[PDB]
């Protein structure tokens, strides 16, 4: 009548990709992780935030380490 397999769970396909990129460290300690990555996942992986909440990441973006958009003087 109005149904079909696959309700909605493809977003992971894009996450399963970046999943190899970062593990949720460089992104943002999140919980103030030490100079380790195996602890970032063992504790609380950032990605998991979207990899798990993918259902509706919402907000998005963070910037904790990278840090962009300085305070240039502009205008010579």
From Swiss-Prot:
Pfam families: DNA_pol3_theta. One of its GO terms (cellular component) is replisome. The keyword Transport does not apply. InterPro entries: DNA_pol_III_theta_bac (IPR009052), PolIII_theta_sf (IPR036745). GO terms for biological process: DNA-templated DNA replication; lagging strand elongation; leading strand elongation. Keywords: DNA replication, DNA-directed DNA polymerase, Nucleotidyltransferase, Transferase. Its EC number is 2.7.7.7. It catalyses: DNA(n) + a 2'-deoxyribonucleoside 5'-triphosphate = DNA(n+1) + diphosphate. SUPFAM superfamilies: DNA polymerase III theta subunit-like. GO terms for molecular function: DNA binding; DNA-directed DNA polymerase activity. The DNA polymerase holoenzyme is a complex that contains 10 different types of subunits. These subunits are organized into 3 functionally essential subassemblies: the pol III core, the beta sliding clamp processivity factor and the clamp-loading complex. The pol III core (subunits alpha,epsilon and theta) contains the polymerase and the 3'-5' exonuclease proofreading activities. The polymerase is tethered to the template via the sliding clamp processivity factor. NCBIfam families: PRK10969.1. DNA polymerase III is a complex, multichain enzyme responsible for most of the replicative synthesis in bacteria. This DNA polymerase also exhibits 3' to 5' exonuclease activity. This is DNA polymerase III subunit theta. It comes from Escherichia coli (strain K12).
């Amino acid at each position: 009548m109005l149904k079909n397999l696959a309700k909605l769970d493809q977003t992971e396909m894009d996450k399963v990709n970046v999943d190899l990129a970062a593990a949720g460290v460089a992104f943002k300690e999140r919980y103030n992780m030490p100079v380790i990555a195996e602890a970032v996942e063992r504790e609380q992986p950032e990605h998991l935030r979207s990899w798990f909440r993918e259902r509706l990441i919402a907000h998005r973006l963070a910037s904790v380490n990278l840090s962009r958009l300085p305070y240039e003087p502009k205008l010579k």
